[PDB]
Amino acid sequence: VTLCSPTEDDWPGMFLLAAASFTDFIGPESATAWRTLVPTDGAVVVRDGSEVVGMALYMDLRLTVPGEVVLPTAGLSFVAVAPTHRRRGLLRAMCAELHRRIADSGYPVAALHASEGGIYGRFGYGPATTLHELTVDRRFARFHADAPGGGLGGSSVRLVRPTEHRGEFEAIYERWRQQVPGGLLRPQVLWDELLAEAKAAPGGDRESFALLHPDGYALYRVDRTDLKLARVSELRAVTADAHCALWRALIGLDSMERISIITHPQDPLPHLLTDTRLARTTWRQDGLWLRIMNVPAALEARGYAHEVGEFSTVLEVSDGGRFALKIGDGRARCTPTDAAAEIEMDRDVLGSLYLGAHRASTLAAANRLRTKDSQLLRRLDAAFASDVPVQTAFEF
Amino acid sequence: VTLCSPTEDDWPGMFLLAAASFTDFIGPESATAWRTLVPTDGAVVVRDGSEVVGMALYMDLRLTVPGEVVLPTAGLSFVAVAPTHRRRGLLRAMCAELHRRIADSGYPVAALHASEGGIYGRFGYGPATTLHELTVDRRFARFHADAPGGGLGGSSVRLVRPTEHRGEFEAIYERWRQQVPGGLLRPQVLWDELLAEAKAAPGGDRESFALLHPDGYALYRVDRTDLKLARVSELRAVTADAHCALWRALIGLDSMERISIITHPQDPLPHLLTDTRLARTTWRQDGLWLRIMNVPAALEARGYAHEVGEFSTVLEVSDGGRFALKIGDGRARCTPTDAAAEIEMDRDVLGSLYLGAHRASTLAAANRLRTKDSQLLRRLDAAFASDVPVQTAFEF
Amino acid sequence: VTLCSPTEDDWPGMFLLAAASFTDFIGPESATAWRTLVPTDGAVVVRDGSEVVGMALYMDLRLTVPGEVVLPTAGLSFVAVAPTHRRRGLLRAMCAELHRRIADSGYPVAALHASEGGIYGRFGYGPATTLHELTVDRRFARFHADAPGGGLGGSSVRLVRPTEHRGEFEAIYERWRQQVPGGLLRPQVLWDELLAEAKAAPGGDRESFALLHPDGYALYRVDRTDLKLARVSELRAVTADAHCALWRALIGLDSMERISIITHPQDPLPHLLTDTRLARTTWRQDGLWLRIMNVPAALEARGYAHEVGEFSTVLEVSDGGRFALKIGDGRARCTPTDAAAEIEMDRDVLGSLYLGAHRASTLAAANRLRTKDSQLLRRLDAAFASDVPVQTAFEF
Amino acid sequence: VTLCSPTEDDWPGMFLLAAASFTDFIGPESATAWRTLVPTDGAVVVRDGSEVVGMALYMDLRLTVPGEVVLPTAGLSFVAVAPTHRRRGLLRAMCAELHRRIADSGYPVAALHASEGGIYGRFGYGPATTLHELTVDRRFARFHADAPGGGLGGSSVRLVRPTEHRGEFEAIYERWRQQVPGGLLRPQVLWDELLAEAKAAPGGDRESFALLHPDGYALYRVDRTDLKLARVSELRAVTADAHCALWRALIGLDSMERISIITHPQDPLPHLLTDTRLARTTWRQDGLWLRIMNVPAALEARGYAHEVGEFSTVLEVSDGGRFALKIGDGRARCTPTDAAAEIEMDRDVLGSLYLGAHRASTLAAANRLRTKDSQLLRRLDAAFASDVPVQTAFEF
Ligand SMILES: CC(C)(COP(=O)(O)OP(=O)(O)OC[C@H]1O[C@@H](n2cnc3c(N)ncnc32)[C@H](O)[C@@H]1OP(=O)(O)O)[C@@H](O)C(=O)NCCC(=O)NCCS
Ligand SMILES: CC(C)(COP(=O)(O)OP(=O)(O)OC[C@H]1O[C@@H](n2cnc3c(N)ncnc32)[C@H](O)[C@@H]1OP(=O)(O)O)[C@@H](O)C(=O)NCCC(=O)NCCS
Ligand SMILES: CC(C)(COP(=O)(O)OP(=O)(O)OC[C@H]1O[C@@H](n2cnc3c(N)ncnc32)[C@H](O)[C@@H]1OP(=O)(O)O)[C@@H](O)C(=O)NCCC(=O)NCCS
Ligand SMILES: CC(C)(COP(=O)(O)OP(=O)(O)OC[C@H]1O[C@@H](n2cnc3c(N)ncnc32)[C@H](O)[C@@H]1OP(=O)(O)O)[C@@H](O)C(=O)NCCC(=O)NCCS
Ligand SMILES: Cc1ccc(C(=O)C[n+]2ccn3cccc3c2-c2ccc(F)cc2)cc1
Ligand SMILES: Cc1ccc(C(=O)C[n+]2ccn3cccc3c2-c2ccc(F)cc2)cc1
Ligand SMILES: Cc1ccc(C(=O)C[n+]2ccn3cccc3c2-c2ccc(F)cc2)cc1
Ligand SMILES: Cc1ccc(C(=O)C[n+]2ccn3cccc3c2-c2ccc(F)cc2)cc1
Ligand SMILES: [Cl-]
Ligand SMILES: [Cl-]
Ligand SMILES: [Cl-]
Ligand SMILES: [Cl-]
């Protein structure tokens, strides 16, 4: 049982492992496309000797954090241990090697999407975005008098074929991702992949359509088994007008009973309607998970809320150093110190705070971060909060 | 069709209407208990002439708002229009008369629980607390190393019969309600009612048990049809230790597969476990709705976040006046003015902001509050936020 | 945390624990009836100091084993640990004390019904009877030409009220239990309890009826929610004629679509019909679990199959001694020895073999009993098998 | 309405009938492969005159029976009567002609799989193997300390593509089928067919994977609609080590909640786990049905249990002769006699006894075999039992 970077000859074994480990497996053609995001030395495999019985890798991503700052980010993915080699320390060994390479390469953060919520905390990852499914019974849906885009004229939204307006989607998404915490750059190959999924498949998913506004788009399709359900796979809007107009069009799908979307907890949709309850929350789950690789680089790179007044504290991360943390004027300074700690937390907890999705007060109530000063808790809550609500870009 | 305060002779007709209008109807014995909370002139009825075809009333309540301030509150309830007299203006007439009496009596706010989410906005009520159902599959539940109350000794929690520890529940609840926004005083008659429901009913609900800690309690029962589901009807905890200890005991119910509770969005339970996902959000809905009766009294009575620096603005409520609003040092001053408005919103929107459950930014994104200054939005968001998370006390 | 025999004052605390631990809890009236089967010193409780946080007990039973031999048997029941005191060693301590008392009192075996199948193996109990649910769609059911009781005359079976024929049921059951491995003596109090359950309950179970034959009876009722399903709670027959006649009557319930029964794997019912498939096995589970307390007394008391020729071996029970085992003429001799073992197994495995429900070959294939001689396996299989098929009497 | 052997021109009509009669119909390409197992004169068709309105055939198979003896066996299949020609005596005529040809060709037994359980008894077929579906919730599955293949080193099992290891599967299966009662030789064309089904189908079944051990294999795939269910289509193991190791690998499929398999009643899997209940029996049904064509050849060819001592009896088969049956030293002699019968049974009953899956005692209790000597029943039970448990090879 050796651990090393795969050669070209290892990839068929890796795809075999992948097909057996991941039900949503993408097939070799698209796997080869995603592979273009894996840097040299971004992958590890474990061979039995010999066949491949373990693999893991990371992709080079760009993540937006509060203050519209974009960070290089290592996106862990394609992680798998053969069913024949469980409980043998392979995951711990693969993760440790990848984390070493990630740290040494200069990434301040790593990130992933969790197949199960209980595997990742122990490797320093905390859930940092929250996914909310809303299902709207559109038969009862009426817009509020206050809602935009219901004056007296033409509509700004068009129903179009996705593949014919790639450039407009790209441009809209690029603007979105640069101003929203959780935003990710979507490279060319992933647009290739996205638009390929837009076509109908024999005995599979149905054709996808798009609603296009100058400042937003929605991609959707009818559910394959429930023909009265439309699933919005992606809705991206830069203005409130674009967001309302797109939802006016979606609610105008008179063949459907229900419209569903995976969105975020601060989606304004429910307040667009006269009956807020019509937008039922049918599902709630963690989205992006974050491991802060370098505490001072990550804390200093992020912008903070201007409303809170300047304050200073000392933060210990359990096996990640102790720092003097000074926050004021929306910026932070984070320097080494051996002074007594005022706040302690494990490294994963810091990831959960980092994009503003969880409150320090709430984590304190679970004793996941310790302090003997509630004024400091209030200050951290306020400082780490995000003006623009945190969202989840796309799964990887 | 006349409108007036009911006499003693009207109550049987009112109970008839109630039995036909409300499936969860409580029967005459308990209705007579709840009636002790209705002040003189707190009820209206509409007679056909003659029988009672419409009714509405309010109860005298005490509501805790941020800053641990307790306000007299008119709790609307028992509202019903006969199926034979729909679409005849009865509700609008009954609500207008009750609101007049409520305003003239000196209540700064009114409140209610909504049978449907689309009836109430037009009468000035906005949803102000959010209910979250969590369902935990307790077979996989493991507590985090960091979680309190897992040292090495005895347990502080006891399993007891509710009716034998009334005084300890009362005292714990009283402490809870005074420090939590959304807290309501629970008078003696409602404790009588609560403990009566704790007994098993033939072909109805099962016996209720309690878990009692010096600083908290949980009341629960096995679901009547799903015998592997325990439903926590009420969990009230004053310290984080009490909250964790109670959940350790609940997860020790080894006969059950699932534990469910109606709680709030900031419940720390998910962070107590090693796998946060095990606490599934199975339901989400509006709780308490608020109508601000007197804007300056309500805005001045509430405490505000100290973290935000002093600022001044002008707020127009659509048919509720225009005010110079100055907020600093956690307090607000709110005085009449005819200066140009910087923020406009309908009255229900203000209720939704009032206990800190919804962000002004989010309501702005739906154009439910208008302003041309995003710095002001950030300031309102921060000022109106609640240090202690907002919760829902009990249904009325 | 002390461990001792309960006093009269402890029983209310015990019933409180029971009501919270067991959903099928029987109420204090019937609990007091079952208590008459608990000998002096047959119960233990664990107090916190003080309230009762753990309990366990055994009942004095009489179990029939192959060869129609009746053994004194300690039937463990009413075992519970408070949810507040889990993972504290209470069960292990209560079980050890009860087992000591059981052994010292002279019981050769103990027995129980398992709330969960994974708790009991480690205390020396193995599953020894198998429960099979059959559901017959009686609309298609036709009896084979060969089946008894379809000649040309009157019927021998009568439809009767259970409470009016107690004596005939008692006598039939007594004959049954003495000739069937797994049979248990049913004392007077348990007949009192059984016939009380036969009456309808408001918002509960429906009235029970009986089909009575001189050599058998069936007790049944319509399912409370599925009104096309009749549930046979108990069918006891001494002759094949009685068994067939009772099933002819059950299939004549023309209001029902389905008849279901919890029976055993060798129930001949499927072979009574022209279409064997109509008797669907809808459920399968372990019934009685056995812990052999005294290996030589238990092995010597049981009868063995005459068909296998005399043989001798050496059996080690993992922490239960090593014995020279000689079997011939349907009897066994089992004496101490230090000669090398030919067969090893844990104590629970021996319980699983003891009533003939599991084959030694099958347990060997799972390596739950070790030997390096397959001829010996064949010999054990044959010797331990039961002429009369093993059945499960009643739950306790 | 004539009955005769089909010509080449009849086969399209036969495939038309097949497509309309069998939902699981295999298509013409694979039907032509299975056709290579049909001997000359192994098929009959009924023409209306003219189109084909009835068909039936048999295939040349090799069946293993207790004592590891392999018998030529006529496997009935592809039997169908047009919906337009029901209740016209076609089946009875086709079966009688095929049975004549089968008998005259020298087959001692015929066999089939039943589309419905009530059609076949009257033509002399009795169910002779039992299929058991086990569904394991693998999230709770833990192996017993006693279970093999959990030492401290590498794994002997590999995850592989089925099509790349055909030869190893063939060799393992060949060993299996020769030592297990119910085993069938699988010719080349059926391996061609099996491996073709291993590939994914568009809007059909998913890709199949294999777990390969030197002495066993498992073939499995994720269920097409329930993506948390893995279905083991075939598991074949020659040693207990191979069987345990394969199940260790299957339970290591961490993406799945449940693993299911169609197996036999003596599968040791449940005893491999600490909680035997985790292996739920979700389905139970008859497998292979047998018609004994020649009673003395079949009874003399089979091996019998050595443990029972020599005995002699007289057996009448209802329309199949009367024989002096002498059994001793694991062999039987079966000769003609006119002496009085001690045991009578229909021919189908004998098929049900023949592979040891049903006990003579059980069939006697249903009066499906008559005798006035219970000692003889015990002797038959013991003699006809199979050392190696009876299994079902593959459907045909
Ligand atoms: C990798 C895998 C299938 C199991 O791997 P493994 O080689 O058996 O794990 P290792 O022995 O290397 O060590 C993993 C540690 O986490 C624990 N662990 C691993 N998988 C687990 C699971 N599914 N549930 C709970 N705990 C788990 C182990 O107990 C071990 O810690 P411990 O020895 O201190 O108890 C499993 O963890 C899995 O489901 N995938 C993990 C996914 C992941 O981490 N990242 C990918 C998301 S893109
Ligand atoms: C009261 C009731 C059953 C219907 O009453 P009604 O006498 O028909 O209503 P009125 O004619 O007095 O006027 C009510 C106004 O709200 C609207 N409205 C009333 N009930 C409605 C409902 N269930 N859904 C949508 N709109 C409704 C009416 O259209 C009317 O406004 P409009 O005439 O401008 O359109 C109904 O509103 C109901 O479900 N209960 C209301 C509950 C409530 O408001 N408070 C109690 C919670 S404790
Ligand atoms: C008794 C009870 C609720 C838990 O008791 P407890 O006091 O936490 O158990 P203890 O700490 O005394 O020790 C029990 C041992 O079995 C294990 N165990 C106990 N309950 C278990 C369960 N529900 N599942 C799996 N393992 C369990 C423990 O891990 C411990 O062994 P370990 O420390 O070596 O791992 C639980 O076992 C239960 O469900 N009832 C047991 C029923 C029984 O044994 N007999 C009654 C049938 S009538
Ligand atoms: C063949 C078929 C569809 C009906 O055939 P048919 O020509 O109507 O039957 P016949 O008239 O030739 O005679 C069949 C006898 O069995 C009975 N029978 C036939 N199909 C039956 C069914 N589905 N259910 C119950 N009884 C049936 C008939 O009543 C008749 O006996 P009877 O006249 O003494 O009552 C039907 O039996 C069927 O489902 N397939 C039979 C499958 C089979 O036997 N072997 C193939 C398994 S690979
Ligand atoms: C080399 C390579 C790298 C990644 C991939 C991908 O296909 C990643 N990817 C993308 C989008 N997705 C949506 C749902 C699931 C995914 C997967 C994925 C796959 C495996 C994981 F562990 C986590 C995520 C394929 C090949
Ligand atoms: C005079 C009088 C006043 C109120 C009542 C009550 O029973 C109020 N109450 C209390 C608790 N609840 C829980 C669920 C539903 C309730 C009801 C209730 C009843 C009617 C409503 F329109 C709204 C709420 C009964 C009588
Ligand atoms: C003192 C006393 C002793 C036993 C009991 C009984 O009621 C036992 N009993 C009987 C029949 N049953 C059918 C289903 C469940 C039962 C229970 C039972 C109760 C608890 C157990 F742990 C196991 C079984 C009640 C009181
Ligand atoms: C000439 C010819 C002979 C047989 C066949 C086959 O396809 C047999 N066969 C094989 C496997 N199977 C699994 C499920 C159902 C089957 C069928 C089958 C088909 C018809 C039956 F009456 C019984 C079985 C096809 C053509
Ligand atoms: Cl970005
Ligand atoms: Cl209050
Ligand atoms: Cl007995
Ligand atoms: Cl064979």
Residue C265: other Cβ atoms inside 10 A: 18
* DSSP helix/strand/coil, C69: strand
Pocket of ligand 2 (CB under 6 A): B 76-77, 79, 81, 86-92, 112, 114-116, 118-120
Taking CB atoms and an 8 Å limit, are D254 and A48 in contact across chains? no
Residue contact C203–B207, C-beta within 8 A: no
Strand duo A311-317 + A343-345: pairing: parallel
Q: Specify the residue for token string 């969790």.
A: A114
Contact status, residue C316 vs residue C322, Cβ threshold 8 Å:
yes
- C202–B202 CB contact, under 8 Å: yes
Beta carbon pairs, A and B, within 8 Å:
135
Of D202, D222, D254, the CB nearest to A203: D202
Question: What phi, psi does A267 have (nearest 5°)?
Answer: -60, 125
Name the amino acid, one letter, at A161: R
Q: Tell whether C309 is within 8 A of chain D (Cβ).
A: yes
Q: What is the CA radius of gyration of chain B?
A: 23
Answer yes or no: is C105 a known binding residue. no
Cβ of residue A119 closer than 8 Å to a chain D Cβ: no
Give the rounded distance of the alpha carbon of A390 from its chain centre: 9
Encoding tokens for residue D263?
Answer: 């197996």
CB neighbour list of residue D288: distance below 8 Å, 6 or more residues apart: D111, D112, D113, D127, D128, D129, D182, D355, D392, D393
Rounded to whole angstroms, the Cα distance separating D383 from D380 reads: 5
CA C305 to chain centre: 22
Q: What is the residue whose two structure tokens read 């004998």? A: D350
Structural determination approach: X-ray
Taking the CA of D58 as reference, the closest ligand is 8
Determine whether the interchain pair B159/C23 forms a contact, defined as Cβ–Cβ distance below 8 Å: no
C331 neighbors C150 (Cβ within 8 angstroms): no
Residues of chain D with CATH 3.40.630.30: 1-128+287-291, 129-286
CB C109 within 8 A of CB C297: no
The distance in angstroms from the start CA to the end CA of chain D is 28
Residue B122 CA: which ligand 2 atom is closest? 16
Q: How many CB atoms within 10 Å of residue D147?
A: 21
Length of chain D (residues): 396
Q: In chain B, what is the greatest distance between 2 CA atoms, to the nearest angstrom? A: 73
Burial class (CB within 10 angstroms; exposed 0-12, middle 13-18, buried 19+) of A167 = exposed
Q: How far apart are CA B348 and CA B366, in angstroms?
A: 14
Backbone dihedral angles phi then psi of residue D210, each to the nearest 5 degrees:
-130, 145
CB B74 within 8 A of CB B59: yes
CA pair distance B232, D165, nearest whole angstrom = 55
Beta strands in chain C (DSSP E): 2-4, 43-47, 52-65, 69-81, 109-113, 126-127, 130-137, 158-160, 209-213, 216-222, 229-237, 258-263, 279-286, 288-292, 311-317, 321-328, 331-336, 343-345, 369-370
Query: CA A129 to CA B384: how far, in whole Å?
Result: 23
Q: How many CA atoms lie within 13 A of B248 on its CB side?
A: 27
Q: Compute the distance from residue C78 Cα to the ligand 7 centre, in Å.
A: 6
State how far residue B6 is from chain A, nearest Cα, in angstroms: 32
- Nearest alpha carbon to residue C204 among A255, A208, A296, B200: B200
Cα separation of A187 and A61, whole Å?
A: 9
> Which residue of chain A has the CA closest to B318?
A146
Whether the CB-CB separation of A83 and D250 falls below 8 Å is answered with yes
Using only the alpha carbons of chain C, give its radius of gyration.
23
User: Is residue B131 a contact partner of residue B392, using CB atoms and an 8 Å limit?
Assistant: yes
**Cβ–Cβ under 8 Å, residues C159 and C210:** yes
CA separation for the pair C356, B281 (Å, rounded): 49
E strand spans, chain A? 2-4, 43-47, 52-65, 69-81, 109-113, 126-127, 130-137, 158-160, 209-213, 216-222, 229-237, 258-263, 279-286, 288-292, 311-317, 321-328, 331-336, 343-345, 369-370
Which bin fits A124, alpha (ψ -120 to 50), beta or left (φ > 0)?
Answer: left
Contact C302, C65 (CB under 8 A): yes
**Nearest bound ligand to CA D289?**
4
> Which DSSP helix (H) or strand (E) runs through B196?
helix B188-197
Q: In whole angstroms, how far apart are CA B138 and each of B230, B254, B277, C90? A: 10, 8, 12, 21
Residue (of D154, D42, B377, B3) closest to A50 by Cα position:
D154
* Architecture in CATH for domain A129-286: 3-Layer(aba) Sandwich (3.40)
Which phi and psi angles does A306 have, rounded to 5°? -70, -20
D3 in Cβ contact with D93 (< 8 Å): yes
Q: Which residues make beta-bridge pairs with D216? A: D213, D237
Q: How far is CA A62 from the centre of its chain?
A: 11
Mutate to test the interface with A, among D254, D256, D257, D258 (most CBs of A within 10 A): D254
Rounded CA-CA distance B251/B187 in Å is: 31
Nearest one of C300, C297, C356, C302 to C70, comparing CA atoms: C302
Picking from B202, B204, B209, the nearest residue to C20 by CB comes out as B209
CB C109 within 8 A of CB C63: yes
Place of tokens 């060949």: D174
Q: Please state, in angstroms and rounded to a whole number, the distance separating the CA atoms of residues D206 and D199.
A: 7
Touch between chain D and chain A: 3 or more Cβ pairs under 8 Å: yes
Spatial distance between the Cα atoms of D124 and A59, rounded to a whole number of angstroms: 67
Residues recorded for chain A:
396
- For C248-261, give the secondary structure using H, E and C: HHHHCCCCCCEEEE
> Is A19 in contact with A25 (CB distance < 8 Å)?
yes
Query: Is C1-128+287-291 CATH 3.40.630.30?
Result: yes
Question: Do A1 and D203 count as a contact with CB atoms less than 8 A apart?
Answer: no
Contact D259, D135 (CB under 8 A): yes
**CATH fold of A292-387, please?**
Nonspecific Lipid-transfer Protein; Chain A (3.30.1050)
**Which chains are adjacent to chain C, needing at least 3 Cβ pairs under 8 Å?**
B, D
The segment(s) of chain D belonging to CATH 3.30.1050.10 are 292-387
Q: Which of residues 211-240 of D touch A (CB under 8 A)?
A: 211, 222, 227
- Do chain A and C touch: 3 or more Cβ pairs under 8 angstroms? no
Best residue for ligand 8 mutational test, from D78, D194, D285, D392 (most atoms within 8 Å of Cβ): D78
Write down the residue that tokens 């000769």 correspond to: D335
Cα distance between residue C141 and residue B292, in whole Å: 70
Q: Give A 86-115 residues with CB within 8 A of chain D.
A: 86, 115
CA distances from A286 to B146, B247, B276, B280, D285 (A): 20, 22, 8, 11, 44
Please tell me the distance from the alpha carbon of residue B262 to that of residue B220, in angstroms, as a whole number: 12
Q: How many other β-carbons are positioned within 10 Å of the β-carbon of residue A309? A: 15
